[PDB]
Structure 1
Amino acid sequence: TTVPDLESDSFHVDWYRTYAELRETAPVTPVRFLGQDAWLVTGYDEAKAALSDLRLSSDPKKKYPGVEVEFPAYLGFPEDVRNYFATNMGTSDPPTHTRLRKLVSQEFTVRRVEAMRPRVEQITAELLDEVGDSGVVDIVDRFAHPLPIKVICELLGVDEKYRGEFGRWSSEILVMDPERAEQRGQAAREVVNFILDLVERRRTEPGDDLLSALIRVQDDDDGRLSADELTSIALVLLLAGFESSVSLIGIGTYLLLTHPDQLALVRRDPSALPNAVEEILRYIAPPETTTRFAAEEVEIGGVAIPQYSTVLVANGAANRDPKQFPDPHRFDVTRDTRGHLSFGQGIHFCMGRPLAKLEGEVALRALFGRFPALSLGIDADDVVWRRSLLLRGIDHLPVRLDG
């Protein structure tokens, strides 16, 4: 009947209750979003099946006769800008996806990530050193946001004097408001221009960073990254490389601050921190929904998704499907979190998982270790959640350093 409108407050206010009510009626249902028809998948089994079915494409650049492909995430994006944003692993299907991922995997290794551990630890310490010993501060602006941004910049060879602008553009892009479609596309163009200059500088002055290495990566069979591929991969690595981690740190801080019992456990047993981060991701997945396009008719959960349909796989809703995660609304750092979809599923499974876990673990351990009496600076019910189905997070979070 009343087709769900993903722009309504129902999806940004106690929204997991909304996902539950939909999942109960039909884990695969028609919805409206940004002026287009789509299918929302809220069931865990259904979401896993969907992400595993390659008939559900990840490429927004593919053309189909008489069809105008529109991914919600590229709202307001001029075509050329979309291409700059979508010529990488996450926006490619095999065989192209296969070679792009293989080449990037040669340099974006666990070794390279672990080599940054000392840097993550030092940056974390320095940021915490600057907030003081007492009073109220915005833990996002002073910590959760600057840490990942500095880490990804060092990984991608982005000099200090070029880190003060893209954070603002990226922020505008996380929100999908039809009212600001033009501003969103303009923010996107700035990011493109920024990446074009970064690549130019790196080709001219090589270093030991990941971008420099991708400029040189090659393989007898897979070949190498074309100029367009290199540029597009650098772009998403820059944005995806810090935004999801900022969300994790902010959400994790909020969850630990509002679940004293859970925080107590993690502290008593340090070996419990890794799974705590996994549960924080299971509880409130940053990539709440991920988009796919039906290149052919595809049946999911007994529902025939018509060919050329836009499919929104609700990774977050799937993580709260009681059939997969019993007592889903309980944040439990001890639960078996295996199988959650916050890092994806299938061929597009997160390539940054090692780094995301490293940052989350280092950041939360340091923050709560430095401030044993840390407390929320506002009522839990007054925290403002980012209005985005692309990347859920917290943009401002007051905390009292000394309780």
Structure 2
Amino acid sequence: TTVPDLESDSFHVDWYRTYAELRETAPVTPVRFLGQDAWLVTGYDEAKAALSDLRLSSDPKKKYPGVEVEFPAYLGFPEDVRNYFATNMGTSDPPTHTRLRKLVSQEFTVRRVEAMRPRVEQITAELLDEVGDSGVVDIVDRFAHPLPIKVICELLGVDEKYRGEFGRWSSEILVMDPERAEQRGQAAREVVNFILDLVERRRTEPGDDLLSALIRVQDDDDGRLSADELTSIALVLLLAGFESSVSLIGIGTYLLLTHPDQLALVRRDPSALPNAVEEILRYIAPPETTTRFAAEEVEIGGVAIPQYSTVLVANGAANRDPKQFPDPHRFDVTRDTRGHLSFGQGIHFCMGRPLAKLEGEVALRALFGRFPALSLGIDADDVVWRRSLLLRGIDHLPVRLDG
């Protein structure tokens, strides 16, 4: 039987049509990717089931007798840089996952996030002043990208004379191309080196930022974060702040710009914004794929997945499963979006949801509430989508401010 190759253009060009074709045939099928066999889950019920079954591990560090685990997200990473990337909540299983998440949740709170609202609003205003009131600009470079970066750097106590470079490395890591495995491995070593220096500097000069708080957080029973745990968690938070919300804002802008009717609703009624953000996430989920490792043989949707198999849960495909979302390919800011898998599901449910929703709502409201005639600078079909199954997005988006 023909086995799909996630590297082919079928998974990067009008790819939701490809997912729909595989789903109708089999919501759980074997695929090829980066020279390795794996299983792709595209059905909603199957994806939800997979993410809820703890026999499917999230820890790339675990060793199993006679098997060589090589996960996509760590293509080209030397073993030591891999460990620095994989010693945090997202890359661990209970009970380790449990204590790491409890310690971090003590400081990465809704209160702390809400306290940043005025600042996020100020930063948004300043960036929009800087773009002008007429002409064509790349809204990604001048807005969608700088906003989340400034926010996450103030949250983690990262200086300006350190940014710019980091963003160059982040971008390389989002693409998984075997021809550039070496450059990817090099960019990853750069980020590890940067984080190590940042942490050490913070231990020496404490502040009221999140990294400082994480450094002294401790619990009677759970103790405190080890040096390695601290380092990996900081790395992962900065990485998420540098790339996740950029996709949301850029993709969000492109969608509202290509659905005039939908944009009107938002403009007409502001209370319709929070749900618009949820539908945007539902329609084109940035984390198109999340990975799991079958520590035991598991059955998903009637299909038996052999032990030691790599499972790619396609969060994005599941969001377009007609069985859960009627008329899936229809972008509708009013539909009921409950249950989408863009923020995950279960114990690893994304801890940054509050921050992402804040940035998304504030940015889009300000952007469109300030450029009534804002329109796309190019033809809708000419937009270039980033070729990443790790984090989908738009790197360049020209828009005409004055119409």
TM value normalised by structure 2: 1.00
Map 1:1-400; keep pairs closer than 5 Å.
Answer: 1-400=1-400
Structure 1 window deviating more from structure 2 (318-327 vs 159-168): it is 159-168
Distance (Å, rounded) in 2 between the aligned partners of 1:263 and 1:95: 45
Q: Secondary structure of the equivalent of 1:208?
A: coil
Displacement of 1:159 in angstroms is 1.2
Displacement of 1:366 in angstroms is 0.4
Deviations 1:209-248 (A, max 9, x none): 1000000111011111000000000000000123110000
Displacement of 1:2 in angstroms is 1.7
Deviations 1:14-73 (A, max 9, x none): 000000000000000000000000000000000000000000000000000001111101
Deviations 1:56-94 (A, max 9, x none): 000000000001111101000000000000000000000
Distance (Å, rounded) in 2 between the aligned partners of 1:377 and 1:170: 27
Displacement of 1:106 in angstroms is 0.2
Deviations 1:115-167 (A, max 9, x none): 11011101100000000110000000000000001100011000121112010
Distance (Å, rounded) in 2 between the aligned partners of 1:48 and 1:154: 35
Distance (Å, rounded) in 2 between the aligned partners of 1:399 and 1:136: 5
Distance (Å, rounded) in 1 between the aligned partners of 2:293 and 2:29: 15
Deviations 1:322-358 (A, max 9, x none): 0000100000000000000000000000000000000
Distance (Å, rounded) in 2 between the aligned partners of 1:390 and 1:267: 32
Deviations 1:168-215 (A, max 9, x none): 100000000000000000000000000001001100100111000000
Question: In the alignment, is the contact (CA less than 8 A) between 2:288 and 2:391 conserved in 1?
Answer: yes
Distance (Å, rounded) in 2 between the aligned partners of 1:50 and 1:242: 28
Distance (Å, rounded) in 2 between the aligned partners of 1:94 and 1:306: 22
Question: In the alignment, is the contact (CA less than 8 A) between 2:344 and 2:350 conserved in 1?
Answer: yes
Q: Secondary structure of the equivalent of 1:304?
A: strand
Question: In the alignment, is the contact (CA less than 8 A) between 2:38 and 2:309 conserved in 1?
Answer: yes
Question: In the alignment, is the contact (CA less than 8 A) between 2:282 and 2:337 conserved in 1?
Answer: yes
Deviations 1:222-278 (A, max 9, x none): 111000000000000000123110000000000000000000001111110000000
Q: Which runs of 5+ in 1 are unaligned?
A: none
Question: In the alignment, is the contact (CA less than 8 A) between 2:170 and 2:242 conserved in 1?
Answer: no
Q: Secondary structure of the equivalent of 2:38?
A: strand
Question: In the alignment, is the contact (CA less than 8 A) between 2:167 and 2:242 conserved in 1?
Answer: no
Structure 1 window deviating more from structure 2 (156-165 vs 206-215): it is 156-165
Displacement of 1:7 in angstroms is 0.2
Q: Secondary structure of the equivalent of 2:331?
A: coil
Give % identity.
100
Distance (Å, rounded) in 2 between the aligned partners of 1:166 and 1:184: 13
Q: Secondary structure of the equivalent of 1:288?
A: coil
Question: In the alignment, is the contact (CA less than 8 A) between 2:192 and 2:235 conserved in 1?
Answer: yes
Question: In the alignment, is the contact (CA less than 8 A) between 2:139 and 2:396 conserved in 1?
Answer: yes
Distance (Å, rounded) in 1 between the aligned partners of 2:242 and 2:235: 12
Question: In the alignment, is the contact (CA less than 8 A) between 2:153 and 2:238 conserved in 1?
Answer: yes
Distance (Å, rounded) in 1 between the aligned partners of 2:177 and 2:159: 32
Distance (Å, rounded) in 2 between the aligned partners of 1:64 and 1:111: 41
Deviations 1:258-302 (A, max 9, x none): 000000001111110000000000000000000000000011000
Distance (Å, rounded) in 2 between the aligned partners of 1:225 and 1:326: 45
Question: In the alignment, is the contact (CA less than 8 A) between 2:343 and 2:353 conserved in 1?
Answer: yes
Distance (Å, rounded) in 1 between the aligned partners of 2:163 and 2:121: 20
Distance (Å, rounded) in 2 between the aligned partners of 1:347 and 1:68: 26
Give 4+ residue runs of structure 1 displaced > 6 Å after superposition.
none
Q: Secondary structure of the equivalent of 1:349?
A: coil
Distance (Å, rounded) in 2 between the aligned partners of 1:129 and 1:206: 33
Distance (Å, rounded) in 2 between the aligned partners of 1:242 and 1:200: 21
Q: Which runs of 5+ in 2 are unaligned?
A: none
Q: Secondary structure of the equivalent of 1:341?
A: coil
Question: In the alignment, is the contact (CA less than 8 A) between 2:247 and 2:392 conserved in 1?
Answer: yes
Distance (Å, rounded) in 1 between the aligned partners of 2:180 and 2:242: 23
Deviations 1:349-396 (A, max 9, x none): 000000000000000000001101000000000000000000000000
Q: Secondary structure of the equivalent of 1:62?
A: coil
Q: Secondary structure of the equivalent of 1:39?
A: strand
Q: CA RMSD in A?
A: 0.5
Distance (Å, rounded) in 1 between the aligned partners of 2:181 and 2:69: 17
Distance (Å, rounded) in 2 between the aligned partners of 1:244 and 1:327: 26
